[PDB]
Write a protein that binds this ligand. Sequence first.
Ligand SMILES: Nc1nc2c(ncn2[C@@H]2O[C@H](COP(=O)(O)OP(=O)(O)OP(=O)(O)O)[C@@H](O)[C@H]2O)c(=O)[nH]1
Ligand SMILES: Nc1nc2c(ncn2[C@@H]2O[C@H](COP(=O)(O)OP(=O)(O)OP(=O)(O)O)[C@@H](O)[C@H]2O)c(=O)[nH]1
Ligand SMILES: Nc1nc2c(ncn2[C@@H]2O[C@H](COP(=O)(O)OP(=O)(O)O)[C@@H](O)[C@H]2O)c(=O)[nH]1
Lengths: 51, 428, 118, 434, 433
Amino acid sequence: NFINTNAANVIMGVAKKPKPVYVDKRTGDKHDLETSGLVPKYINKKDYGVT
Amino acid sequence: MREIVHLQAGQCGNQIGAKFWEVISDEHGIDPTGTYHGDSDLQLERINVYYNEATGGKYVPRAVLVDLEPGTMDSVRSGPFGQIFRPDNFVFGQSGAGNNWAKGHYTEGAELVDSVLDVVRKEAESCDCLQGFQLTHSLGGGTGSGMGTLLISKIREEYPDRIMNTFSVVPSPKVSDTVVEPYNATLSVHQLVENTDETYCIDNEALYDICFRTLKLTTPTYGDLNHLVSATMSGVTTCLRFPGQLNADLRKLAVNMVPFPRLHFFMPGFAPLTSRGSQQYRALTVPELTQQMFDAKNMMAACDPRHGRYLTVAAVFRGRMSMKEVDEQMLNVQNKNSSYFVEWIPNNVKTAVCDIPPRGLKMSATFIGNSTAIQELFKRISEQFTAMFRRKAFLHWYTGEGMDEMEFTEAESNMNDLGNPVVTRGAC
Amino acid sequence: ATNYSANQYEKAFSPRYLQNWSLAKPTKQRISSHEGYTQIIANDRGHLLPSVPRSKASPWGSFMGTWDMPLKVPPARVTLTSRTAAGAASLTKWIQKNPNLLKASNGLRPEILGKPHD
Amino acid sequence: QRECISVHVGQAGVQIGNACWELYCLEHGIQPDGQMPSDDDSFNTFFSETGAGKHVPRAVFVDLEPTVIDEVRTGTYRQLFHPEQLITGKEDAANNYARGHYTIGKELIDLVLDRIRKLADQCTGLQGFLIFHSFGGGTGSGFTSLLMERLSVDYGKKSKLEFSIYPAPQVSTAVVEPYNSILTTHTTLEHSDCAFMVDNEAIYDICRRNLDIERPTYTNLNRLISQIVSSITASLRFDGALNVDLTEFQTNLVPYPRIHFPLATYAPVISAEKAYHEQLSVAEITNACFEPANQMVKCDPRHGKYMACCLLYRGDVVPKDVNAAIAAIKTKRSIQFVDWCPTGFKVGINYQPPTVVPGDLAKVQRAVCMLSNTTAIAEAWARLDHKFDLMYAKRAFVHWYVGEGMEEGEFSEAREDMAALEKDYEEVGMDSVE
Amino acid sequence: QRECISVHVGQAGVQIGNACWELYCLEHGIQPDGQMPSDDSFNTFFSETGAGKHVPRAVFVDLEPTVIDEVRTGTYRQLFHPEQLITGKEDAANNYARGHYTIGKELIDLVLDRIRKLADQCTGLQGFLIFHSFGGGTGSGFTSLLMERLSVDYGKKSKLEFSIYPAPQVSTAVVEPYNSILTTHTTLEHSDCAFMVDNEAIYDICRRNLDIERPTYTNLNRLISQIVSSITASLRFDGALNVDLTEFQTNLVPYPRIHFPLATYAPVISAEKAYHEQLSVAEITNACFEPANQMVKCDPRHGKYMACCLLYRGDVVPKDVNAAIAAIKTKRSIQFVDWCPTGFKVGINYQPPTVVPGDLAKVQRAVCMLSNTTAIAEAWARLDHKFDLMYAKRAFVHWYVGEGMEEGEFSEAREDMAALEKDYEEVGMDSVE
Ligand SMILES: Nc1nc2c(ncn2[C@@H]2O[C@H](COP(=O)(O)OP(=O)(O)OP(=O)(O)O)[C@@H](O)[C@H]2O)c(=O)[nH]1
Ligand SMILES: Nc1nc2c(ncn2[C@@H]2O[C@H](COP(=O)(O)OP(=O)(O)OP(=O)(O)O)[C@@H](O)[C@H]2O)c(=O)[nH]1
Ligand SMILES: Nc1nc2c(ncn2[C@@H]2O[C@H](COP(=O)(O)OP(=O)(O)O)[C@@H](O)[C@H]2O)c(=O)[nH]1
């Protein structure tokens, strides 16, 4: 029963946690957020403040 | 020497006081630049009641302009008599009241009350013997009601022995101009009752009636409507501005019209009013002035005095006129109409007769009436408020700005506890 | 920065008068006078002294950006007037179930006024 | 000291924007280059002098797809809008609220909120934020929600009106509109202030009957929506008799919390030929705004009760004739009115006669614009629900939404609160029998 | 009496110097052939020799020819004394070692001599403005060698180190991580103010604010030159609040270690966008804070300001500057550390920024902020993470070990760099009491 299969498929699904991308210019230029320095990413390391 | 500090709050207060300053500048001879260009020496004799002296013969109004939206003052400045006020008395704030009594009283207007009271303090201490304050506002809506009554309370706790006259534009019986006029009127009247010493209630529908039926105006504007309120304003402060016999200033008028402290709501009236087809049919005499005074056609509040009893009555005349005619007419009206006046006050009418009329007439007459018919206005606001308050309608913003249920309950109960002493005199 | 008060001249240096329309930092009104010297809390390098019970917040400010903010953001205004008990509970549990939005530099700062009909 | 930031979001927006800002310009003189051909400060409500005599529009056009905004960056008004106030993106949002409040929309939010801040840090007294969108589209329903919510986080209890194109009562230009519309109302029910609603089907008829345009396009319609934005903002640009600011429409209209969906209706929308035979008098203009064939939102106001109606008379309107008209309309027992609103007719009498764009509509020396909150908008919410359900029943076209970031459940919470909204219109309707 | 000597080091420095001196020669009229076309304001940067010739008080130094052997055949060959331009004969080949131990101990002698001569023809030296890339050999190796000896000699004399810092993503060197950690371990206790201007940042700023999609190292140097001409406008032109070089340190560097201030400029328009902009003191100031107009890819919002120094060149009425800093001190987006109540230096000059036939526009007012944000922790963390992705596998260590740098150093260096992390964190915490 394809109605019930499609309904179960859309009911029991988690979506993405989508990838964070930011646009800087008026034109629409996309840049990834993690690789750029405009995010706390390397603050939360394991060797911070310790040898 | 006596002085009056003129406060104008709100859009309505600003416009009415702008027309009033035009009226009194015409009466005193002050040109738009601010000099004197006149004919009689009787105009500078008592000019230190609304005008402060400046350098080189400049006369500047002693008026504080208050509004939380600096847009109506802009039109007032762009008008003819715009460059007459102090720029330092233009106390405005960048905001929008949005017709909230709560926002005009318990928020952003409270951020302007300090500057307003600074200017009021400066004007009050720049005097020899201050007698009181004249605030112009509209009960229906914000700024004039909320911020206006906040200044009323503040100025009353600063100066407790000065006459406070509130020219209040009350909500209309037929149509309305703000949705939350029952709320604003209820809270503002609750503030007005235990505060001001004199309240003149002007209703716009009554203004339309006296502009269409009496004046026979074809296109009445708010300038025209404001002008008659301004005429009553100029009429009431006449005895301390021009010489005459039986002078009656504001405190003498207050003494002779309030029998009890809560019964200070009045009904103004001006009556050299004649139509364009009928000023040449006019039969000028003091008895027609009394007749056109007392009839329920020139009342500037929408309260028929024939539906009640007159507690107290005042007439301030303006012109060289005999005393026998005035006295006999205002004994004759009481002797003829006996069910419209209270019996426990014998001769419940006052008379003042000054000598110098407005420029253009020969006799003028200002009517003040404390009557039972204001029960109709306060009761009408009462069922409008009750119908709006049972369902908690439009209470969203009044409680979002900080107020409570007990505020509105206390306001309605106080306005009913004033509706009771008004009606107890109709049944003695 | 402490954002002190200019006492008499504050209507100028109010946030909405200096053309700042975003919800701004408050101003410290009453200045508290202390007496005597104040002991050193750190060392030459700037590290705190060992005893010195420290704070618990992050060393950096909690600027919660457009990807760290919770979805279905609660409203800034909530006055619970002419509203049912269930809807009032839903809105209050919403603004209580978003805690990190309430404690942030770019936070919400909600206004929770009114009272629902029992 | 009366500026109004306008954030136009989506084709509809960018397009109503073109119309709105053309009228704005022809009204204050600002030519299609900024330079005002003077040889005074009223323009500040919408424009910002650079000092070199260039007046720059105070707006932030935002559209995840190019095209629309790009035709504005290369057209008559290409030198007015500061480049960084026309913020487009690269990819569209396929009529999917999801990719407007979650994926291809949460990327342009940072920059748009940025521009909005600079256009706010230059205002000496902001009145509000007029957001123009379409309830039925990616950016229109998606970016608006995110923008509205993030705005509330910053500008907290600051006014935020919402002129919108409400889903049609029969036509419709999409198959997924119903969904986007219900989702949008939910995220903005508590974050928006007074969202005005204009249906397109309605204007289409008002243009075939009252404006003699047999085949109306989106521009004929857009230009009439510009006349409405003028009257709503006229008081804070031109002198009048009863000024009405943009903070009073939230108080003298929105009655109870949720209910915040006023409806628009214009007056003297006549057409040259049929104006050589009409005294367009205050009364005629008013009675017309309450006729169930002019309401620019197909929703027969007769099948419901009025809750709050704020009229805005722009032109030569004797104050007395206004009081007279409102009285007559009140008597008429056809027009109804809830009991909890004795006084339900607000009035604003400005003086500047409606501006004539070299294009359509007659030169009227008088015109009104009503903004009532009829309980008759309930039919519309019911119709939107029939639609949302006829599809949600088979979880149709939901794969796309779960295919962005909208957890299936959200669809339920949305329609459930839309059902609450309908139950609200029932209560605010019933009249206490006591 | 207000002289300052520039010690441009490395190809990076020798090229930032070209633009800088073009702007310095323009500002004071000094022609490309060293001859002011028929007053004493050039003495801050140019000394006048008997034969009416204003020679530059600078020492361009590269451990290879080429870069400087192109300034000696360029349009500015009759300006620089044919001895200031000191050149080696073998590049340090991206090896701090071949620039602090090998090819370098053979040039330090001459360099310090030319510095002494230029530093003896100066009554009052405000300080030495050094320019180096935190990536290449000369830029790291020599700068250290120079700074260390510069200290021994000119002790108290300031030593401002304008420097190009490794970028978040882009980078034109695989041995960059190492070199950087090494130089910032030796120039951490022998330097003073170290202004960092990352390229990725400028590259972006250009595309965004000037619309130059594909820029070039020139477009960059020019903008870096306007930053230096702003730090040294009071030592030459007239102002309302003048700030000496000595001040930029005292009122910026909090604790000895935290000596790495960041940089940002205002009116960065392109003579076409500047037609729709007002460029008012408020617009220019709020932009010097906007995270998109910073010269080091790093959102300061995710950090805490420690001491911002805002310079104002042009028609800046004092009250404007006040309302601006005041609106900043109210916005929540910007937050400060607790130990810094007052946190803003203000320098109001009068000379409008000059236009060098290039990209920016003629503007009436313009600002330049040097904030000491703690948001630069990410930079040190990132940089060290990379030094550790390699100094773990002992990669490219044979090169440095074979020119001196006894392997041991790499370790001691990363240890001090771990202390940098600690400091930045602790020097930004709080106290419940
Ligand atoms: N006046 C006017 N209304 C429009 C215009 N375009 C669309 N609309 C209305 O708005 C609805 C959809 O418009 P939008 O939501 O703005 O479309 P969008 O968000 O830009 O989405 P896409 O362009 O399809 O990517 C349609 O059903 C129309 O009724 C327009 O250009 N002018
Ligand atoms: N303005 C400008 N900046 C430059 C130029 N060339 C390099 N840079 C900067 O300098 C950095 C690299 O400098 P270094 O690696 O130290 O150059 P080096 O030490 O001389 O090394 P070699 O050229 O191989 O001898 C680059 O990342 C750029 O940021 C230039 O020509 N002009
Ligand atoms: N007499 C007179 N009344 C006015 C005038 N302008 C406005 N009003 C009255 O003012 C009332 C509304 O003013 P209000 O809402 O208080 O303005 P606000 O104080 O700015 O909020 C209306 O009912 C009008 O009748 C005028 O020029 N003359």
